[PDB]
Design brief:
Layout: E1 3-5, E2 12-14, E3 21-27, E4 36-40, E5 50-55
Antiparallel strand pairs: 1-2, 3-4, 3-5
GO cellular component, one term: extracellular region
InterPro entries: Cytotoxin_Cobra, Snake_3FTx, Snake_toxin-like_sf, Snake_toxin_con_site, Toxin_cobra-type
Protein name: VC-1=CYTOTOXIN
Length: 61
């Protein structure tokens, strides 16, 4: 049950059972800085509105 990075510097949230990967979300507005981060098992495909980047590591995002 991996950890995803939320509050700086390191502060993290615990991924739910069955989930592994950590993702961050971008907006067509703010590409530079991601707007949401969390856990998921399967990395969500990119949308027109928001972009998804996942990692198989702890506190990447």
């Amino acid at each position: 049950m991996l950890k995803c990075n939320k509050l700086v510097p390191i502060a993290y949230k615990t991924c739910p059972e069955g989930k592994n990967l950590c993702y961050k979300m971008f907006m067509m507005s703010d590409l530079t800085i991601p707007v949401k981060r969390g856990c998921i098992d399967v990395c969500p495909k990119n949308s027109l509105l928001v972009k998804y980047v996942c990692c198989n590591t702890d506190r990447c995002n």
